[PDB]
Symmetry: D2
């Protein structure tokens, strides 16, 4: 059997409430990794599992500095011969951020599978148990190698680069509308459909094993009457980059343009993404800053932070966004 | 033959570029309303149309005070016996904000149909001509009455309360994933599917007659390491409300909570929405602020601004969000 | 507390397997209604529940004659002053067929809610318990009256006229891509989004209470090289109607046309639907047969069968398809 | 510039109607290939194009014997030094069938791009011009090689193995809900997202050179009261295979089982697919026949016919279905 380590960080999958009917407002990251493993003994037939408690928090509190530590730990684990893959339990809210970060920084082809749950472990029809079993099956399957970081939940396997939480409260919230899933798990069998056509893991130039923190990047929303003062505030607090969750295709109002101009003059890298949820923000030389390709705001921030650890050259950063 | 006024405000539907191959980075709000009408003469066979140039700008620059005037003009036009419906051409980027605003403030059952286009009028296979023809057909059909404000594009009829631009650059970008479309237009025939189960138009309490400004409301994004200083900034600039495009179901980091607590202490109304794109943000007494129901950040801001013209009572505002 | 009758017919929601990992190939309709009720005792705090075992079969074996009896029993139940609503457990495979049948034949505004499950009751993370709890909540809410027959599963409420099983094996399989959901259930709260703009239940002319059998209607698929002989066979076996799951918008090959013409010559009513899964099959005077509006093949067969109990007039049947 | 052959077969992209408002009921395959090219002269700036009129028919009439000649003609063309890629204009109704056939029989890495249109060439806002332009761009791009056969339309690049017409009449009808698009075309630029993880083209064992016909395979629908006699009919007409567009995960009624048992006894290969539209039909020893993996009925018929040109062994055919 494959040797899989289950690195727990918290989340609803490890969440609990007083009643089985409470599916909201519960406490995330309240249960220990062994408790999750013990709740689904069946996993032992899929692999030799070892639980490790990295953290136990609600993912809304996951921070870059900690995600960095998470990446370094997974790298140490995957470096071992006695480890065939890693399953990371994480909160659903920012799992797309943590997953994409590792997608870009893990220097190994061994499976790295993030797993989450939309209902707490104590809930009626809790999804966590099955999601966990599926994540371990994916992590231990030899066919799962070299596919980049994955997010497993609700019978689906999504690429960290495309998958995103699209719904605030549904079990089937994780989807990649335009890119689909890398594969699915039905009847205890994995069906691989796609291989992402982007750079990742072993072919990524991003290495952070020698860092303890990342460049500061904030996200500003785009909407009617969007204020210039928010750009002022960001610049003033030392951001190194600003990701714009823009209206439509990263379109900018006169006030947004004024703010971006100020940011650029201060050496801040401006990256134009979109608030819409899907699609391409195309290049436009008549607008300030760079464009995020198909990266949504949350994903764009992660890549920009990592990009900033290697260069401040706009052209190099722009190419990164079209290839990662 | 129905009397339809086509009120123009700008957008890509009135956009142009030097070549038929340029579908991005073009000039929005470039063409006059009569140019659009004459480009699709067939609308004249469907109704007695009258073009009126309200404005001609890119929708990223559309502002609340201008939308306020737009709503007042439409209410005025619909009060006339010689006007059966109004079609409003608008840029795609913020049409959902302007459409929802009128959805709440136009006191008439006569059809108010926003229309737009994802490709400029000069582009190969431009969608504007057919979108406009369909919009006029919907506005002039008597079966279209009392349905709330609609947004017509790509053969679909979406409610202003549900429809949103989901893709940065595709023709089929406008969708209401969980709510579907009010109707579709195929083979020159309208197929009505649903009636929205929410308050609007003639049953709305949002009277804006005579107003010349709206309460200031800004939107702050939720993500890993989101900064508390953004809340400080908004508060310092006298916002009356803050809409939070939060992680998951409006989940808040320790920094976001600190920021929200300061806002609430200063009398700012905090509305928790989601950055995910769809779904319900459920009540949670353990978290600060109100919840946006299924309203996304953009729609949430519009409703909060209108709510604030009538009350500052959180309970009344919250009920508005569950009924409008 | 409302009085809710839970009418069981079978399905995976009442399915069993030897192991908790067995999610496919299990036995449907193995557990009794009372076993389902005691399994999720929480339903007892939402309503005064009473179980009734109408049947216990895999829905792939549900038949028109049995659905007729189901509709008749439901009408009987709802006529009682001591019954406020009914929840019907049914297999997922043909639930859209049984649901739409009752949608057209139940002469009452009291809630009729079909409920199902994609995972057997014995599977880990089985969805049945929560689906049933939600179905009862919907059935007993006064706001649920007069919305037509609904299908509740995976936190969603779908109209029997639009909802369909879109995926062979996923929990989120039931969707109405173009029409959306009537509502959703999150955090033990119901959020009603739409009201179907079609005739049903109390406003339907399809009363079948005095019937024991229904007109035979078969469905023939459209594809490259589709054979004429399938039509000859249907005709020879006395079909009164043929529903065509056609290529595109009910397009027909030279062979299909010959088959349809032979059928029409022999007194059979031909209804052209689509194999695509969604959308409108528009009127076309250059093609034989009627068109199914937005009804997919499964739904079209149900409406055609019922239509044939009242008329053989093509003009009348066609209007039914545009209004029901 | 690259040398691209535009091989025309007909379809709505070559359709014509007497007015610009008629988007349905038009005549498909009415315009010649050179006419389409002269309508979008911009293609000549993307490549040196040469039109070839293979046929001019509505795709509902495309037959296996003709598709064989199409595959053989394309193999012939791609073997040439002077042909960098081929764009094939085809009707939308069965393009998924023709495309998947070539996907399995064209032994070249050069781009094979099927293109189509949902609105006739004479229609207002016709999509054909842009679709063709995008198809030529994809066919001539070096980055497009070795991706399997593609279907380009509405700014999307879909794999022949996953793409399907999901809506009877919309412009955005072609989608692969669970698998996404291989890539998208926005702002005259191609954005490749995925590479399908299946066997195709150069790695296919399906040699069809020399064949003038294919084994007969028919499709039968699954629904309540499905008749056993259609199986009898298929058997009587000597079908070599039967694809079952089944209820749910290829579930079978008692009548369907009886019919399948008869077919199997007669040496007919039975393949269980699904009518739902998406998903995996998992293996089940308790049921007759093979399972179609994620292939829908139309795709399954194509693969089964080709599978039968190699063997009748069920085990081998089942493996073809899990790998192609
Ligand atoms: C429970 C559903 O995921 C809530 C968990 C969320 N706050 C998190 O990101 O941990
Ligand atoms: C063209 C497609 O909508 C871009 C127009 C947009 N900037 C606007 O909102 O006007
Ligand atoms: C289990 C998922 O619904 C299979 C049930 C199906 N055969 C039925 O319709 O009963
Ligand atoms: C026009 C839209 O595709 C109709 C074409 C269709 N009948 C075909 O397959 O050719």
């Amino acid at each position: 059997l494959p040797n899989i380590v289950i690195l727990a960080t918290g989340g609803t999958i490890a969440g609990s409430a007083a009643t089985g009917t409470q599916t909201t407002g519960y406490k995330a990251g309240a249960l220990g990794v062994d408790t999750l493993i013990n709740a689904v003994p069946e996993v032992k037939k899929l692999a030799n599992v070892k639980g490790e408690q990295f953290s136990n928090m609600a993912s809304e509190n996951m921070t870059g500095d900690v995600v960095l530590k998470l990446s370094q730990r997974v790298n140490e684990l995957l470096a071992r011969d006695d480890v065939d893959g890693v399953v990371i339990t994480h909160g659903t809210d920012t799992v797309e951020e943590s997953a994409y970060f590792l997608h870009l920084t893990v220097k190994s082809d061994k499976p790295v599978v993030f797993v989450a749950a939309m209902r707490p472990a104590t809930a009626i029809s809790a999804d966590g148990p099955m999601n966990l079993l599926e994540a371990v099956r994916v992590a231990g399957d030899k066919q799962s190698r070299g596919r980049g970081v994955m997010v497993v939940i609700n019978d689906r396997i999504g690429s960290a680069r495309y998958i995103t939480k699209t719904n605030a409260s549904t079990l089937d919230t994780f989807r990649a509308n335009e890119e689909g899933y890398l594969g699915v798990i039905i009847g205890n069998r994995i069906y691989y459909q796609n291989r992402i056509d982007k750079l990742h893991t072993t072919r990524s130039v991003f290495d952070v094993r020698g860092l303890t923190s990342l460049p500061k990047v904030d996200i500003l929303y785009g909407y009617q009457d969007d204020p210039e003062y928010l750009y002022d505030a960001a610049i003033q607090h030392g951001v190194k980059g600003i990701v714009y969750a823009g209206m439509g295709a990263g379109s900018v109002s006169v006030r947004g343009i004024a703010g971006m101009r100020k940011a650029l003059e201060k050496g801040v890298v401006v990256m134009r993404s979109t608030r819409t949820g899907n699609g391409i923000v195309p290049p436009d030389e008549e607008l300030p800053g760079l464009v995020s390709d198909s990266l949504n705001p949350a994903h764009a921030r992660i890549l920009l932070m990592l990009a900033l650890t290697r260069t401040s050259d706009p052209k190099v950063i722009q190419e990164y966004f079209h290839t990662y």
